[PDB]
Amino acid sequence: SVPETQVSILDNGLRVASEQSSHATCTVGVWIDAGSRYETEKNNGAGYFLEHLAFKGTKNRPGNALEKEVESIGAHLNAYSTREHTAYLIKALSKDLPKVVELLADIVQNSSLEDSQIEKERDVILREMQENDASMQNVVFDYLHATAFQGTPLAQAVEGPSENVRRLSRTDLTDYLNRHYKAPRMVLAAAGGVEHQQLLDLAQKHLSSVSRPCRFTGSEIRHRDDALPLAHVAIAVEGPGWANPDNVTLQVANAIIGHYLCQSFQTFNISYSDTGLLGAHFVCDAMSIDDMVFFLQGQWMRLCTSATESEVTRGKNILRNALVSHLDGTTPVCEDIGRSLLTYGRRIPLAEWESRIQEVDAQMLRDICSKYFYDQCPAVAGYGPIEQLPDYNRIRSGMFWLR
Amino acid sequence: LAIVHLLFLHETGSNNPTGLNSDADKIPFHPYYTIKDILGILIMFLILMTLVLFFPDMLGDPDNYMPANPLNTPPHIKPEWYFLFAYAILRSIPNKLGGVLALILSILILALMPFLHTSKQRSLMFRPITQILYWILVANLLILTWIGGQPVEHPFIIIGQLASISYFSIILILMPISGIIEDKMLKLY
Numbered sequence: 377s378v379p380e381t382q383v384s385i386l387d388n389g390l391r392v393a394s395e396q397s398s399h400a401t402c403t404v405g406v407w408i409d410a411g412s413r414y415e416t417e418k419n420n421g422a423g424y425f426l427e428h429l430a431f432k433g434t435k436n437r438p439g440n441a442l443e444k445e446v447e448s449i450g451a452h453l454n455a456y457s458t459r460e461h462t463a464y465l466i467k468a469l470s471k472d473l474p475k476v477v478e479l480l481a482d483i484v485q486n487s488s489l490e491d492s493q494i495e496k497e498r499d500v501i502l503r504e505m506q507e508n509d510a511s512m513q514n515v516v517f518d519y520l521h522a523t524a525f526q527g528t529p530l531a532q533a534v535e536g537p538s539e540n541v542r543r544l545s546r547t548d549l550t551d552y553l554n555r556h557y558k559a560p561r562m563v564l565a566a567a568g569g570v571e572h573q574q575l576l577d578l579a580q581k582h583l584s585s586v587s588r589p590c591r592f593t594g595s596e597i598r599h600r601d602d603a604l605p606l607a608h609v610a611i612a613v614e615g616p617g618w619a620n621p622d623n624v625t626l627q628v629a630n631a632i633i634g635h636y637l638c639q640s641f642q643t644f645n646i647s648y649s650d651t652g653l654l655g656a657h658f659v660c661d662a663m664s665i666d667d668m669v670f671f672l673q674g675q676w677m678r679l680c681t682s683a684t685e686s687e688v689t690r691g692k693n694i695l696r697n698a699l700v701s702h703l704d705g706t707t708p709v710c711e712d713i714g715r716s717l718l719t720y721g722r723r724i725p726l727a728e729w730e731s732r733i734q735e736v737d738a739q740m741l742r743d744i745c746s747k748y749f750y751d752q753c754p755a756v757a758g759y760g761p762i763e764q765l766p767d768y769n770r771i772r773s774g775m776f777w778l779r
Numbered sequence: 780l781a782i783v784h785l786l787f788l789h790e791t792g793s794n795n796p797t798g799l800n801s802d803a804d805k806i807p808f809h810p811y812y813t814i815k816d817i818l819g820i821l822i823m824f825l826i827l828m829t830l831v832l833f834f835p836d837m838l839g840d841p842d843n844y845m846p847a848n849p850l851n852t853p854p855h856i857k858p859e860w861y862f863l864f865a866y867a868i869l870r871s872i873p874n875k876l877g878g879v880l881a882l883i884l885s886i887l888i889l890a891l892m893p894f895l896h897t898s899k900q901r902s903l904m905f906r907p908i909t910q911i912l913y914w915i916l917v918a919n920l921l922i923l924t925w926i927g928g929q930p931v932e933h934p935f936i937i938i939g940q941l942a943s944i945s946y947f948s949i950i951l952i953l954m955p956i957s958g959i960i961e962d963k964m965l966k967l968y
């Protein structure tokens with residue numbers, strides 16, 4: 377009896393979905409199908425820099441008076457950008473539902489990009505990037521994306537290269553804004569104490585104006601810097617995509633893999649439009665580097681060859697307990713709702729997820745794992761003291777067993 | 780002794796043709812220098828089987844197909860070709876003992892070789908004068924191999940005497956002096 381997420385797309389193309397909950401606090405967001413994948417290397421940081429500029433004032437609400445409004449009701453304002461999606465979300469009370477929607481309308485259209493601000497946000501972005509290098513796992517995952525999707529718009533980062541950041545102007549931004557902010561590529565998602573008819577009327581009142589070959593590459597990239605205390609290594613293979621159901625099975629396998637040797641093991645299934653990265657990013661000391669790998673590759677081949685029913689049942693329980701991702705909290709659900717409408721075109725209910733989980737057994741798990749892991753060329757990204765990290769022949773030979 | 784040879788080497792690792800410290804660029808051996816050794820084994824087997832199955836007597840002597848006659852001496856006595864360089868040296872020195880000693884030194888001069896290195900560069904990749912001296916050394920080693928074959932008569936003898944003098948003078952004298960000159964050219968000496 378999962379609460380349905382009623383959806384009401386506009387003629388402009390603005391899908392308006394919402395799910396009501398007891399919480400008297402509601403989270404409302406706008407999702408846009410626009411990321412670094414839609415950028416063409418001349419505007420590689422346009423989405424990030426617009427995400428910085430989007431809260432610095434609009435035409436109707438000039439400057440900090442705008443954020444004074446979102447202080448006045450005590451609401452929280454957040455935004456994020458990925459390689460495929462951009463989100464602007466507000467967590468507020470239920471009774472403040474209209475003005476929040478109106479605020480979101482300004483943020484998506486009628487936004488004002490001040491030239492003064494552009495220089496200030498350039499120094500912010502430039503500096504952050506100049507210090508972003510500090511976060512290793514971000515460096516390793518960016519390296520993995522670059523070496524796995526070389527020559528494609530999926531290699532380039534969300535932030536872009538410092539070059540573009542410095543070389544960006546209002547008009548360029550205006551373009552990205554006027555090009556990738558179309559109404560049919562937009563979802564107004566609401567979760568929590570909201571009524572769907574009131575939210576649909578508010579979307580009709582404001583926001584009714586919005587205008588109406590991906591390739592994986594196996595490659596060894598190695599950023600060696602021996603002064604760092606720890607090494608971060610990510611190994612991935614090509615993922616299926618958003619719409620392919622065996623993702624669910626792969627999620628179970630990821631669960632079964634879990635994390636057993638050197639510290640900081642983990643597993644990811646990053647999905648983009650009919651592509652993705654499925655793999656693991658461990659981080660460790662000089663010696664463990666290899667074994668962990670060796671360790672890690674063995675587990676993958678075990679999931680390709682010797683999966684039993686007990687670990688499959690454990691992975692199914694871990695995945696179901698992971699449906700808590702949906703939970704009931706306004707934010708997470710809203711977020712989930714946001715993607716559902718952008719990626720699948722519909723909100724998949726938790727009962728359908730439970731059905732797709734319970735149809736997974738050990739035989740189809742090792743079949744799908746052999747389809748996606750066995751004898752595949754991986755993408756490897758290492759950063760730190762990575763001399764004992766094995767080169768591409770040893771990893772590629774560890775991607776299969778002679779028995 | 781080859782096992783001891785391999786041990787005394789792994790303690791230090793193999794050298795590279797540039798002669799520099801290759802610690803920044805090292806790779807595994809299983810997939811990179813194993814298939815390379817397998818290919819070299821295949822090529823060496825090709826040369827060995829075309830030596831056996833097609834020209835089985837181009838390197839041996841025909842007179843070894845006669846039985847050993849103590850009464851009959853052959854008109855010309857040789858060892859097999861790889862002893863020739865030494866044979867030449869032995870024949871060159873007039874004194875019997877001298878010949879034996881020089882002969883031994885011929886092989887031993889090599890052992891003496893690590894104490895004659897006077898250059899600040901390990902390899903000859905960046906050392907052209909000592910490269911020229913090295914190829915002259917290979918040249919008169921081939922000359923000594925030829926002379927051994929030739930019988931005792933003019934002018935094979937003189938060549939043998941010179942070739943031996945040039946061999947010992949290039950290994951003993953000319954290469955360290957050339958290495959000093961090469962260090963002087965790079966503003967090192």
Ligand code: HEM
Pocket residue numbers: 781784788792793794795889
């Ligand atoms: C019984 C005959 C010999 C065999 C089978 C033999 C075999 C080998 C092998 C397998 C290696 C390592 C791979 C390579 O060759 O590069 C090697 C290295 C070496 N051998 Fe020998 N060897 C022999 C005689 C000699 C002799 C007589 C010397 C000295 C004159 C010598 C000096 C070396 C040196 C210096 C290395 C290290 C080469 C480098 O890494 O640059 N070996 N040997």
